[PDB]
RNA sequence: UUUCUCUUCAGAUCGCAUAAAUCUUUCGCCUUUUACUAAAGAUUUCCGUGGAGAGGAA
């Protein structure tokens, strides 16, 4: 039972595999599990797991390419923190340009809509957090 | 035994025997050569409670009880039955690092020796031991301690434990074909190449000294006529009387079993119990008459005693130690042939081939000892061809020593020779050859190898090939002292235990730290204790450990890294790769060498490494120091028609590659599973612009900046943790390795006694304190041991700016390898900001 | 004189399988893993806690911490914290890790794991194939189905001997309990010791060095950090004694005639002991005039009318008389606790469970702390040996009543201590009896 | 003790000047 | 709850702990209970204020630390 | 500074004016390079000046040496010690025992930059502890009106000249402490010789316009 | 063969554990001292112990 908890519970090793696969062979996330497994099919190494079910492996290729998708996104947040331009009324189009140079927003996603959204939601968060600033300043006003 | 008689013995002829021990944690080395003493030096008596070294003549081994200074010890020992014979015997420790120590200090003896535990077995310092003396071609002569501890711990039956005793024979014979094909050493059960040993109780004895005890008492003709089958598979037939290996009764045991293993038992159990009622009985029948004085003792004392009285003075291991053991007259060819430089066919080979005194003197100093007063050390030393004398001047040399380079040579006087005893010393004035004398005078001059010829005369004299280890040292440390106004004297103690320990080597890195590389964690234990307390009085400051990494290519190049020369006459252009792991190690096994034809490369590449026709026949040239796996290529359209200038400048393409290995760009340490081809190389017909100030660093940027932009990859090393446990300890051990980064390779449980062997790797980077974390959860039942033999790549691509780790986690990203790309850097001094990528590029 | 003896072979393995029950079966010696005595003297000497309890005060270094802030040998960039570095690994070999050692010591590094059958009964043979290990082999490339070759010369290899030890008792008679004693590594190892005191012999002192609690409350814990404290402290102050011209009292005195020789039962020389204390106390406050005082025998010394107009500054001993009173009425205590166990009290195990509760009382009811404030050491101790006992006693059916106990080391710790004491007591009288009897 | 002991600065044993004894119980 | 210290100069400074509105009868018990000495046999003063067995603790209105002469009958 | 004064056996760094103000985080970084940069430019600074005139003696004075490596930034001004540290460069721990963390907003952008985190000097608790040795070696006739005026006076002194680092030199407060219940030492003993137990300092905190002292205490005097 | 006397030599964990005191240093205290706290070194005292004459009962 200790046994097959290390390999099953912890196939560990062949669980670090296919996160290895997912991280090695694998560095976007535009990538689906489906689509990356039919590319990758080809590789030795995508054999070393064999010992996992192909249920547990989309699961964990999914959970990778979501993880590459956050690492993505909080890279375009920290480039557009740097945005000197960036304001409350900062425009999503007309910030495109300034995000150009910053790879973290060309390469996170080839979606323009989804670039607009990421904008309006990094300008919700400052709007957040400069709201709680201003009532933590007017409880300390006298 | 008389000292004239000693010096008779020694320019007497070749009977005198040269050995060397092997053993591992404590299975029978001490402990045994405890008895041999006493049987020697009867007036040095053994303790009653405590267990008498005569091994550890220093404190660490006193206090740890993990041996590490090879103490040998020469005696008189009067074994063989009607004749006597000289024996120097060099005692070794177990533990792995020592075990490399010990193997490098095995050139010496034209034998060996193994002590295995009657009940553990077979260990993993065996596992590489027998592996590393078939390499050396030496003698084997398997003998088995600590018996007492499988009669009486676990109380097992005759059958089973002979059962048991041919399981450990079955293995260790495998492990022998599987090392090599040496037929004639190899199936040694029964031929006199196996000898038993009860240190702790005194209870040794062989077939042959068996034979000759019922022979003495009432017997027949000796053992060349009863002992042929006495192993098992005959049982004994008093109806024919006479031993029936055809099929033979029902109630009836082996001839070991019945003969050997049955009053082996029962005077056991007449001494432990019934030792009140049984014990006169039972030794006026057979045995001596103690006093009553002498059955007022503990149970192990007098048990002791009378085994001692039984075999009453040790005659059963000179009658095999001369028998397959051979003498040096005729073991100088071998050791000699594997040993020195060149062949057989040098003057200097066929003259030190016979131990001839009156000859070419070839002298060789392995092991450095220390003496009461630090400032001078003496030299232990294996006399091959000559005699030396009091006062007599040698010419010590080094290993970068050679027949050109007259530059490693300093003369030095003789002072006083001594003999190894390691609780005496007896002085001498002449020593014949095939000999061990304690040099003085010479501490100075000598390295971590030496050689000696005469100061005149014996020119035209080669040296011997620098040892090996079987066993890479990882470990890297930083020594610093305490007050920075102290560093010359802890670098004169740095530079005297250097001197002390073999395995080790000192360094000074840019970043001007005093770097140590250790075996194991015990081994800089030791070796800092033997600093601090005697090399080097000084308070001195220690920082954590850090494992010597090495560099790799993930897969091929993109683009050709063109590194042009200087003068604008020279353009080199290297594409990198990888190749087989097994081919690899096997340059580095020393499988498959250099000095070969081209046709012999061909066939070992078309073969082990299946290259093609033309690209085997294309090799360019070996990796750094002709050891390490770094194979250069050069092979192309143009290469093939302008290949001889680019040949008048390859020698020093290939100087520089090899200095360029020796210290990347990834993390300033060596590189490793590298496929250097040289495609384009412009090759200036003027060698003034196209000489060597244009030839090694273009080169070297060409090597690095193809290492550097072939997706690089580090390779840390992985341990071998082999721990015999019960199974708990198994469920706590895979709880640990789970913890630890393990990864389990095999864990059975281990017949003879309730160890199941939990065989897996650790690296040495969650290394720092294995044994200590599996000793301490188990419950002191997980004495484990490591051994770093397998390198791995780690997972990381330590090329992209985005991870950091800035506060101080234990990096569980895999940015781990980035992780320690920056630790490396900032330890030692480099550039942290390893973006030499573009600057290393060359465009063109 | 009874000097030392002789034991067989069977009566130490009845006396094994009777303290059994007061013995460690756990014999390795690997066990202990560095909580050994030089794991602690090391401990010590590095400023470093073993989480086993001995938290010591550093030694005469005074040296805390923060040598340096951030060296170039200690900058926390230029390091690969893969895992951390206890206080475990420092202890186990401190020369590498422990910067600036100084007074340590090494420990032993046993890996010979300590192998045994422990059998069920003796019921079964002595070398039993007990089914544990594994199979002997399993071997199946052995093929030696045809007779040898060794035939010919096998005819004419005769054994002309008789044979090994055919007229043997067929190993097997009462020698597994032999086997057995050799694993008992003081008392039964030895099989013929020396002449050995009663109050030497603790009892308890291999219990509280083997990890004992296993969830356990801070009080028992505590209480075996203060044991091996005391241990450790006891191994340091260790030096061999040879002096003294072997000095012997109450072997002059018969030669005199100032003592006689009897043999008096116990409880009558107790009783006797106690009436010759207290006709000496009141023979002192007589010989001082003072009417108006009594001990009234349990050694309390009462008052009678309010003394207080120059009285109260007259009897303000403070030093000796109330360290007499204290120890006489300890002693008095007991003595009078076995005539009521002899006179009719309640005689069975009450009477050791009113002992451990006397050995409390004399931590705590006993007003000694006056005289002595050192006492508090051993008293520590005896209230430490109280939880290390329950934890051992009160454990199963017994799980909160009030377990009577043992007094094998709480009488002992007294006895040292009155022993050690002694002659101070000697002393203060020496020079208190000369300024009552003979001036100032 | 009808005090809290927890609001003291650092810890109060006692300010009697005979503060001989050190212990609290923490390991 | 309060504790008082029944002191004495001649070796006997004990320190009991009396109840709120308990009596006296009860204090020499616990002052017999850890002095070793008879109940009924026990005396308390404070210079000839000789307190009784059946007037109460907060009759007197003693509070914590409230040191009281103890003397035997 | 190595061609006037080169130090190769990396004798820099041994003597070095370094303050406790926490040396584990805080102290100066003793790297090699920011050692060197402070050695120097002392050296350089006493080269302009005579050594006869005056010359800063390195064994009163003290650098504090500011990069990559060293982010703390230590300062000892004629009062209390000081360390800024900035708060968006990669801050240290800001421990920040007591409320003392000084805004340094931008004079231009008006953002937060670093917090100047104060602790008081061991030149002034020396002060206060001299103080504190005078006046209970002030003994044998004088009234507590006057002790209890002078304590007021030493502590106005100590406090309401740093109050933001009273609060933060935990060291600072156990002492007043200490030194409050030195002072009630023969505050209570001066009466009679016992010391005694429960004494509540009601007789004390009751000002002289009342009739007592007007002990104004910092001290926790459960009451 | 067993014990009691006694001058005598002990570096054996003299005693498979363990008491105190004096002195000199270092902390915690501290209202004066004695009682104290916990670390190092040394000298003594007590419960003792080991190996060698001579002299006294069974
Ligand atoms: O009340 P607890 O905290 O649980 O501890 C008690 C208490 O000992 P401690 O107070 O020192 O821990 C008792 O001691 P006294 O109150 O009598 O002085 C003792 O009883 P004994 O005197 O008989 O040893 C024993 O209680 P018990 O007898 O039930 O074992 C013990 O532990 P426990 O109460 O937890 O059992
Ligand atoms: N007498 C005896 N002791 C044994 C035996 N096997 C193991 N031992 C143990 O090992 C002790 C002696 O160790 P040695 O065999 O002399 O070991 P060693 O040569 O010091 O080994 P390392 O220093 O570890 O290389 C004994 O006292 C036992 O504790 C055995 O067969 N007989
Ligand atoms: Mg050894």
Redesign the interface.
Known sequence: TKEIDREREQREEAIQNFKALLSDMVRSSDVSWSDTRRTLRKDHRWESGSLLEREEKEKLFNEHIEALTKKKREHFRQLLDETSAITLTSTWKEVKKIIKEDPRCIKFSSSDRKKQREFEEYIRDKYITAKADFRTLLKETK | YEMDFLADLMDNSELIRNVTLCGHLHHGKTCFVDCLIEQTHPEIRKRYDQDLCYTDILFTEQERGVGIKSTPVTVVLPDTKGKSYLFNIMDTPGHVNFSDEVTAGLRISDGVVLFIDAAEGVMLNTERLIKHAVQERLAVTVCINKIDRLILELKLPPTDAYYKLRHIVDEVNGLISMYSTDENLILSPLLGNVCFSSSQYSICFTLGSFAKIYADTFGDINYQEFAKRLWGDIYFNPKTRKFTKKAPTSSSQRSFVEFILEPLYKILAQVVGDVDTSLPRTLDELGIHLTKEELKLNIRPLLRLVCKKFFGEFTGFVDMCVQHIPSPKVGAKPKIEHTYTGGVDSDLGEAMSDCDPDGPLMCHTTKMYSTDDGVQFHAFGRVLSGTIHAGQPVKVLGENYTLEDEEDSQICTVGRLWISVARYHIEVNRVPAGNWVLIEGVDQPIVKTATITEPRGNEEAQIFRPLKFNTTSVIKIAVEPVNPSELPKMLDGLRKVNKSYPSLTTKVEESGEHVILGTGELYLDCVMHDLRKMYSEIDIKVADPVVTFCETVVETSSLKCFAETPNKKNKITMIAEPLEKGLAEDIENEVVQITWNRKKLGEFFQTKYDWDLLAARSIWAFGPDATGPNILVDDTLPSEVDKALLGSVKDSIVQGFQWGTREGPLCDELIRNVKFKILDAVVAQEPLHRGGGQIIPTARRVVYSAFLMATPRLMEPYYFVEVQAPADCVSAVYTVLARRRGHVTQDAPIPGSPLYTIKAFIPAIDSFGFETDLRTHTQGQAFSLSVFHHWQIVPGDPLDKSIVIRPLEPQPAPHLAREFMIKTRRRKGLSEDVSISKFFDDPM | TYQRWQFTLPMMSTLYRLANQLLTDLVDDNYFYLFDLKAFFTSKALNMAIPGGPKFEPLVRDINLQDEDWNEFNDINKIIIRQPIRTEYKIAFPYLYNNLPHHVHLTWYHTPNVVFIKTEDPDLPAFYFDPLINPISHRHSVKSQEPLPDDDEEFELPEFVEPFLKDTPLYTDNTANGIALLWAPRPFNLRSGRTRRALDIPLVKNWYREHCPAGQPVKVRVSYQKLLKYYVLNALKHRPPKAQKKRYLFRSFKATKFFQSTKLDWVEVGLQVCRQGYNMLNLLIHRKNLNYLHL?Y?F????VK?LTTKE?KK??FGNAF?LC??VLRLTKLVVDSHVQYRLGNVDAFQLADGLQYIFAHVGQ?T?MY?YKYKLMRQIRMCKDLKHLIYYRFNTGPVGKGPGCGFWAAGWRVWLFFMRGITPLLERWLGNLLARQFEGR | DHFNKTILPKVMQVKNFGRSGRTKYTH | MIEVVCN??????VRVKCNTDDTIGDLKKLIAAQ???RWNKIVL?KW?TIFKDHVSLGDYEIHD?MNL?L??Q | YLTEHPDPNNENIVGYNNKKCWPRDARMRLMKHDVNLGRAVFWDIKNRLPRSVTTVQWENSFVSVYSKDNPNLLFNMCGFECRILPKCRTSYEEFTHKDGVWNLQNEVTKERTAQCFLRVDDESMQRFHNRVRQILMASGSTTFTKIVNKWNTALIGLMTYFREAVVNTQELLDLLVKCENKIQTRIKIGLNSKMP??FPPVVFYTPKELGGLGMLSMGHVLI
Do not use: A, V, W
Request: net charge positive; charged share 40%.
């Open positions: 009234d349990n309390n010394l009462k008052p309010t109260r009897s303000r109330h009173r204290e009811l007003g006056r | 004495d100069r001649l070796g006997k400074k002095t070793g000495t003063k000839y630390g002469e003397y035997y | 137990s429960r």
